[PDB]
Amino acid sequence: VNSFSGYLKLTDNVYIKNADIVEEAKKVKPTVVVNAANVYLKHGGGVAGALNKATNNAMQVESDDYIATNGPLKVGGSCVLSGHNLAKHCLHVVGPNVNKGEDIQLLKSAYENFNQHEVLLAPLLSAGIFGADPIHSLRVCVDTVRTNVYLAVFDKNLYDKLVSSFL
Ligand SMILES: O=C(O)C[C@H](NC(=O)c1ncnc2[nH]ccc12)c1ccc(O)cc1
Numbered sequence: 001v002n003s004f005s006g007y008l009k010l011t012d013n014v015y016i017k018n019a020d021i022v023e024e025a026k027k028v029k030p031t032v033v034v035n036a037a038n039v040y041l042k043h044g045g046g047v048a049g050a051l052n053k054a055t056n057n058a059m060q061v062e063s064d065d066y067i068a069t070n071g072p073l074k075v076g077g078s079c080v081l082s083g084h085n086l087a088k089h090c091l092h093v094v095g096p097n098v099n100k101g102e103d104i105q106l107l108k109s110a111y112e113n114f115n116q117h118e119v120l121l122a123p124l125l126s127a128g129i130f131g132a133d134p135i136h137s138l139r140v141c142v143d144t145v146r147t148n149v150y151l152a153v154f155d156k157n158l159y160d161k162l163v164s165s166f167l
Contacts, residue, residue: 002119003028004150010166014142014149018159021047021123021152022054025086030150033083034114034122035059036130037092039072041079046129055084063092075102076109091117098131107137111144119148128154138162 007015025033036047041063043052052059078093095110096102110125126132153159
């Protein structure tokens, strides 16, 4: 039993809710929140911009130190950093950005990072400003993640479409 509330169950291990991941993280304080990161951990907009703003830029400060030490992530890769005031940990995961020309096949690799964590609060990878089809992102999520994932979908119209078209 965990603290997530109001989610629709899609599968044994995948759940979905129309919610702002920032407000959801602040309420649940999950062990792991997933950030829709880029390889440079520059949290300028989208989910990443929103999560970083909610940390009063502490996420960005920590991220800049991480990059100065380790260099950029790989597309499809991830790193674990602090969750600051939002969660115990933040799993920064780099889904491919279609608006940069990156291979959509890397989306499965991106979701594989979730399997290293028993329970996660997460957005749909590569959706929104990363330019992929969210219906597809959801299919890959369900077919790749085996741990317990709670998806927060910001847009109500998108959420209703995701549920009504789910196979
Ligand atoms: O629809 C989606 O969920 C994908 C994408 N989502 C986010 O960027 C997002 N997801 C969850 N929590 C969040 N908090 C702040 C941003 C945010 C999106 C959003 C709006 C839109 O019109 C089209 C796609």
